[PDB]
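Box 3.1. Reading complex inputs
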Amino acid sequence: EEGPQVKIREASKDNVDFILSNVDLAMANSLRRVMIAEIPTLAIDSVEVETNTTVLADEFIAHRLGLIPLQSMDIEQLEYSRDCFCEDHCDKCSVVLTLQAFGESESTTNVYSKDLVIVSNLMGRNIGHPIIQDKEGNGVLICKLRKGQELKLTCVAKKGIAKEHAKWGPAAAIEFEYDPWNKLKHTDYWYEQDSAKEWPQSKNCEYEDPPNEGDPFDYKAQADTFYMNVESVGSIPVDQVVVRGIDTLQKKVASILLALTQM
Amino acid sequence: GKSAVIFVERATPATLTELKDALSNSILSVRDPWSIDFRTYRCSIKNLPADVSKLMYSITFHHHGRQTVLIKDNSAMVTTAAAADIPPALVFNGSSTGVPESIDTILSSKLSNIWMQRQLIKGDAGETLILDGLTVRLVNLFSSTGFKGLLIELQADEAGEFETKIAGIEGHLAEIRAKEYKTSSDSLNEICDLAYQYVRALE
Amino acid sequence: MNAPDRFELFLLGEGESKLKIDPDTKAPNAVVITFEKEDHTLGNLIRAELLNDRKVLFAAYKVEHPFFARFKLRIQTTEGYDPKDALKNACNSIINKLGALKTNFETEWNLQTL
Amino acid sequence: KKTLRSRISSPHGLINLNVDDDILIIRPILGKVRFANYKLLLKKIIKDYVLDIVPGSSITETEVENITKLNKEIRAFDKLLNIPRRELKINLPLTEHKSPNLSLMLESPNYCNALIHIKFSAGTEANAVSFDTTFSDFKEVEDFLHFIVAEYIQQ
Amino acid sequence: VQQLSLFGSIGDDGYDLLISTLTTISGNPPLLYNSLCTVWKPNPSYDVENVNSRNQLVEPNRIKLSKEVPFSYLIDETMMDKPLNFRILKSFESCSPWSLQISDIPAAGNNRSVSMQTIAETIILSSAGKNSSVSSLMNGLGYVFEFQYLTIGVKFFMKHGLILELQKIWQIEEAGNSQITSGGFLLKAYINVSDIDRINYTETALMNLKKELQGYIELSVPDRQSMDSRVA
Amino acid sequence: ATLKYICAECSSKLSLSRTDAVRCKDCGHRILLKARTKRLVQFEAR
Ligand SMILES: [Zn+2]
Ligand SMILES: [Zn+2]
């Protein structure tokens, strides 16, 4: 087609395995960094506690509520409250979640991310839905109550990035490898007898030609072709972790061009 | 005189130029750049009589007098921090010290307990495009949170044909794929309506 | 307690430009751009692209201390060429490269049935 | 009167004056003569290019805090200190379909040179024209008068 | 703005002598002038905390609105046809432009050679809308009318920006205007300063004027507390 | 409405004032708690 090229190896709701060729390592990495840190997500940010009869602390629970993944598909049409014009929050900038739970049962009563209810007007946008990947359809286990154990609270979810808090991290681990045969001599293999026998062969070795000993060292050789795997948490779909990552980095660069323009 | 303010919510720093070119074949000349500050204050009074806003807007025009118009509950107050704009009689009888400052400085330093600055939008290095009987000003508005949008100021001495002029500019916006924008040409003394229009288009 | 606010990493300070371009004294046709509320994510990316420019003689960036999200980038170009222009072109090249990357990923993704 | 006024009103302090700004006694005065010359040539040009060409035509020239007691005294000499200007209106015969009107204004903004302002409109709302012009050179006023009388005024 | 000043006074009978003295000393005869001041305070019905958004203490203060009025509004019929000069003082839709001022209590210091007061001022040029009266606008800011006074006097322009005002003050109420200065005139000498130098220079100018009138009329530094408009 | 103090064991609300007797109604136990403020507390979820 044009410049750098992609070749997807495997896909799911949760994973994207692909090959990125005709790219600078610096670019591959900068994208990898952005996916981890700069993609916006919606996550619980304020927790007003009306009642808590639980064995857990108000803030212990509060902390967990932030780590619960929320639907951030249409996150782009929500404003950062900081940029919003209200007094604290509103609809244009937040999602209000409610949680009322009580131990009616003699048996232990469980509190799940499913038990969260949206109270704010969604403006008909795909946002704030607790992500349920759970087979039984419960989502994240927030708490356990016994008998008169009541938990009544209110959550304000806000747009944010992983730089502010890791709760707004839409990506789990991002796998990243290049040159499975150390052709580039980018690592000096620690060994005891044989580095080839001692160090396990990469999966990606199959997608590259072995060096063949009867050849001189390619110094001219440079790093292109990157075997990556992007894992999603739920907030954004796997593809959009890649796309939005590409786009964020693009926007980030545009700001610099624009800054120079104003100067 | 007449005026209208168009605020392009959905846009990027580039949108300005895109619209700038859709007029390339309508332009005539380009005067000096302009500037503008748009402040939002929130009242801290807690007994505030029902239906009295808690919001007050401050629109500062740069070299439109270094003047600042305060707008609250559909009412406006025009102020100036320019010693050169002081009515001569007020300097003579001592009503004025001859050395004024901005109403915003006063608000933040002497009345800060009653009024708190919530937001500050600034538009620098704006452009003054001169067309046929219609002056069109363009500037990129920025907040403390990066780009905030594009602002179009439409001023026309020609009291007559105007509704057409505004519709025309809105059309060139359709061309550059600038959808989901707000336009105001409302009214409440030129400087006052202009200031009001910014409020309607941004609030 | 002595902990700085987390937004300080990305949100520009009161009266603090993203870029501050200062000229290098020690070398002709060399400049030093300080990038506020930025990290390696952008620094190493730009530096590597300026390296691809033939008319660029020197390019390097450094995050002088990790408590602060800012980096100094030094650009030296051949006489006649402007370092601000060099930075402008590398910035552009990056965008155009990313634009193709997105297009190529999108096309390839749409082909998958999972 | 001016220095005193400059001291009374503004300064709370002392005067500020410029020779260039404050220069004019004699230089402002000489302009009076040069303008008279300029006005003479202008009327000659008008006779040649216009009056002689169109028969009925003729030309008519026309005049273009409380310190107030002071400002009134100074205002009285505005006659002597004004940048010299006269308007020469050219009377043209009325065509029964439309009435063309032409006038020129002569002025000396820096006191020693001349600007010539020509306005022409002969409206027939189908044919309606308007010219608003400024010339620093009598050579070009002859050429523009000629152009005007040719197309629009002549039969 | 920093206003450095000194005050004094004289009884009605000292008028002519003082006018004659200031005319010779300054070189110019007096200039008649007036001003109406309306003072406003935070609405007592409304109540707000006295702190910043940064949670910093803010002291409530009065706002002073001042303008002029055409002299004809101060001359009745008995006053009619009387030289409109310094001698007259003896026989005693939208909003208009106004000067809006908030001042601070003068600078502290024992043995101050002059009074030094900081003044925050802005100018109101006009208004529009529903409630465009200056009164409504003040209310919109959360303030209410408290009191107002008229001042009539003569002023003298002197060197280095020094100004001298000989004034009479009348408080205004429907119940009637009462002359705060009944008996004589309030004398004020001052200079408005927008660097330490110009401040020490200005002090000197005032000190030389004080020195030049010593023996005849005394000019001194008024009590700080008497120049404090804070509400309490 | 209003529960000034709660019981430690039986968890029955008490609502008593100054010099009322520091004890529970039914069970003996002089323990007794305080019951949360009605001035709802908000926490950052970080
Ligand atoms: Zn909001
Ligand atoms: Zn009990």
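In summary: Chains C and D do not touch (no CB pair under 8 Å).
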